[PDB]
Swiss-Prot record, chains A, B, C:
Homotrimer. The chain crosses the membrane at residues 8-27, 39-57, 90-106, 114-137, 153-170, 189-208, 218-237, 246-263, 269-287, 301-319, 338-363. It is a multi-pass membrane protein. Residues 28-38, 107-113, 171-188, 238-245, 288-300, 364-391 are cytoplasmic. SUPFAM superfamilies: Ammonium transporter. Belongs to the ammonia transporter channel (TC 1.A.11.2) family. It is found in: Cell membrane. This is Ammonium transporter Amt1. It comes from Archaeoglobus fulgidus (strain ATCC 49558 / DSM 4304 / JCM 9628 / NBRC 100126 / VC-16). PANTHER family: AMMONIUM TRANSPORTER MEP2. Residues 1-7, 58-89, 138-152, 209-217, 264-268, 320-337 are extracellular.
């Protein structure tokens, strides 16, 4: 099977798995001390829950026999009939789902019942993630329309980003969100998370070529390029508005990483530079706007991943370079690829937001998403885990 | 030599090396602030000491010319006559030894002299680890009886687990262990360690196939499966007894990882599910029991690794699937494989505990294992390292 | 292109990238709480700035058309004409530059303007790093004289080490540096950085063979060997002078890693043992000496990397083993290789120090390197980033 290709994907799988707790640390540092354990714990639970549902039926529903082009069958339930390289693909994809669910916890920071999060996550993975993966990567209707998504601009970033906006609107603002600002309890912990996310993204984008080839190498080059450019943009914006906070710098880098994800294997370094530059700008504007609208989409999964994934996914249809990986976008003579991307971006953006809204409200009505006021006050570490982060 | 296979093992080696300080962080977060540096430092010392002894003679004593089937000769001392792929195997195995020694520090948490730990570790590596590795992986008597151990269920987990129980009983309870409970100074630091251990285990179990092949891929699938199931079990037990603490969740995942280690390359996903489920249950019962017996085996190396490695090693003889890697267990028609495992588990469990007990007491008599009461009071960071963790 | 070789280098690239924030954490734990974010932020900025300059022209100036043997042309600007494996080489080398710049931040700990650091870094990368890389690795004059540098003993360690000494002397001592000692705010954070640096060094030295072969395997064996020996030396020195602090242990390991870097692919285990042992000793003496001279080269980039890289680079000419990788040093009959190393070490050491001194003073005159006294007092987290590390 080419030991080298299996070697690279085995490693890329480990790298993406690390990104799950990586998201947890990234977010934990931005919430209050009394919620530090909860924020981290949520990412580990996201991993555990995803592994189980994925092998049980999540993998099958995503990449199984296509039915009407919107979802897969159950022929791969419990991995029945999944062997050889399919098992490695299954494993690799499993981690994309896990990271997606973790990114989503941004919207429930500091005020959700763990049990309700588990319920909603299982429903979301089933009715939003699996479908998306199938549409684009499982021979679904979007792939048929000619839409592309190299590493998850829509499957992972738009889905979690817009799903996060809907959840934030359903669960409500944290107490004191509008009156007083919430200070990050540990920026260093967040920076450790940021380091693990940049590192693991080598496997996220670089492993999506499913081989140690020229496409993987290109994906690694443009991924670092877009991250650097977008991170630089936020640094400049920071100086323009005051001082360059470290949170802004890494948030900018992640915007660049999310935007380049859908295009990593189709664009050149110059295209990567444009994607990162625009990503840095549009994502910053999105953050300021949701803040102005007073929406407590806490850790900006929407502004960074949602908007970052949206731009990047559209950018594919504009900048795809034929000399890089065969596909050509608008600027390279093919207006058709741009239309496929817009259809894909429009579909996934609307479904993610609207279906998540339905799922959130449903769970809220069935069991209640938010913790009591007193638990929010004492913190979820004590309330939901009976633990104290630091002594 | 197949660049792909060397690529995967070179990477798996780096991954296992990371697990050494990973254990240090995992444990450091569970002890008091005044002992944080000591707990971490012990894992780095474990690495440094292991590298030196291994190249000097540890590697040879483990995989050198067999003498009577219980130990290897000195033909590989100072790596004399070790080249090519043997050097990569030597390097990879070196890290398993290091992680094993680090896991063991669980038993001396907060009250051991660093010098004595170094002395005991060198003796243990020599008279317990090297022998075990040789018996099972160096063509020793256990391998001859037909016993199997894919990634270290006995060599690494039973050995450190039961060695930890003996050391805990020899060194004694921490001051105030029985009167008052010791609070973890930093659960987030422990969660960072847990993230690094799960990540590195991709190289631990996945690299034991010694190639980027279908066995490695299978090992990676079942390893994540068992971890998820056992982690889920502890989460449920947590809710049943109160709230799901994050420590319980990751401790459960590690139980699953330790239990699947001896079987990662021989069982299927369904077998992995049973191993993880039982691992979660038996390891939790073991923790409650050693606690009830008031044994201060501090960070539960015994309950998690000892008992987890024991079950998993026996499970190999029950669930090994011929279609996975040729070997068949009791449930697949071969009762012979189960008997080989029981003999191997019975031998390694008794030797680890009894020989470690002799070694611990010997070192205790020769130099004294435990620090003075005043040093235990002020903490080992100041007392043994003249350092203060946080300012 | 051999999927296995691309696999190993793709992974080695991710590993070296992780070392950049790794340096940040390593250093952050050693400075005061009020400067924790600044120290970490500097490493992320080092990464972002390096990625941009490298693709823009840094890569070309280092490995482009040679002009007079001292620098490369601009034929590779914006990666023009860089494809296939050259892109992977470009990516891999990019990270060496980033780590080098991060190591350098040792000299400006707690008192530099971020803007000035960015300016100086861009100038340094242009006039010191690019030249060095070209001289030794880009077919420059030093490579022509027969000088060798396997993974960066001179390109990365001597350059940052001596550049750090010059910068420290230009920017001046931190307030209270001579009167009172600065306590590390978080040794555990530093130990997390040390763990990431040891881990990533598998890709640093092991990936420099540019293939998953016997040279990579050898590099990995001797790299861990030298680290262990030098780390052991500092532990012993620690006990001789009091107690073995964890900072001393990991600082010793890093000295061993820096010293073995230039020789990783040319020496045997016995040579690695000598290099690590001497590295441990000479680097400790260098630290004590710069301290005695009251030079506030804060986090000892000079004593560890500068002196460690110098010894190691010279050691190559003494211990290179023909049976390992063809090259032979003085002890193996070839006095010629030693002379090439001394010329290379003498040139890079003098240029790094003198040119950096010119660059530092120039930037200081143009914009001012040091922050105001009040900003140094309140801390750079607030002053330069308007952030507070912990709440």
């Amino acid at each position: 099977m080419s030991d080298g290709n299996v070697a690279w994907i085995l490693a890329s799988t480990a790298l993406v798995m690390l990104m799950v707790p990586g998201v947890g640390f990234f977010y934990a540092g931005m919430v209050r001390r009394k919620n530090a354990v909860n924020m981290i714990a949520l990412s580990f639970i996201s991993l555990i829950i995803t592994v189980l549902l994925w092998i049980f039926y999540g993998y099958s529903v995503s990449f199984g026999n296509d039915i009407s082009g919107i979802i897969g069958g159950l022929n791969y339930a419990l991995l029945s009939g999944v062997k050889g390289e399919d098992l490695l693909f299954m494993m690799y994809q499993m981690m994309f789902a896990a990271v997606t669910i973790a990114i989503l916890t941004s919207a429930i920071a500091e005020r959700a019942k763990v049990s309700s999060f588990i319920l909603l996550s299982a429903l979301w993975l089933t009715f939003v993630y699996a479908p998306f993966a199938h549409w684009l990567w499982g021979g679904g209707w979007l792939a048929k329309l000619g839409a592309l998504d190299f590493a998850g601009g829509m499957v992972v970033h738009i889905s979690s980003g817009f799903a996060a906006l809907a959840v934030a609107m359903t669960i409500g603002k944290r107490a004191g969100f509008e009156e007083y600002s919430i200070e990050p309890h540990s920026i260093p912990l967040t920076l450790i998370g940021a380091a693990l996310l940049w590192f693991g993204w080598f496997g996220f984008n670089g492993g999506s070529a499913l081989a140690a080839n020229d496409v993987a190498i290109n994906a690694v080059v443009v991924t670092n390029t877009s991250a650097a450019v977008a991170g630089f943009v936020w640094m400049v914006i920071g100086w323009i508005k005051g001082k360059p906070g470290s949170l802004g710098i890494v948030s900018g880098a992640i915007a660049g990483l999310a935007a380049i994800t859908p295009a990593a294997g189709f664009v050149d370094v110059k295209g990567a530079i444009v994607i990162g530059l625009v990503a840095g700008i549009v994502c910053y504007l999105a953050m300021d706007f949701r803040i102005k609208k007073k929406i407590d989409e806490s850790l900006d999964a929407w502004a960074i991943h949602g908007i970052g994934g949206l731009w990047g996914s559209v950018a594919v249809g504009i900048l795809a370079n034929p000399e890089v990986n065969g596909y050509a976008g608008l600027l390279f003579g093919n207006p058709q690829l741009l239309v496929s991307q817009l259809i894909a971006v429009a579909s996934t953006t609307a479904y993610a937001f609207l279906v998540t809204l339905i799922l959130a409200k449903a769970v809220d009505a069935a069991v209640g998403l938010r913790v009591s006021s007193q638990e929010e006050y004492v913190g979820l570490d004590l309330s939901q885990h009976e633990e104290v982060a630091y002594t």
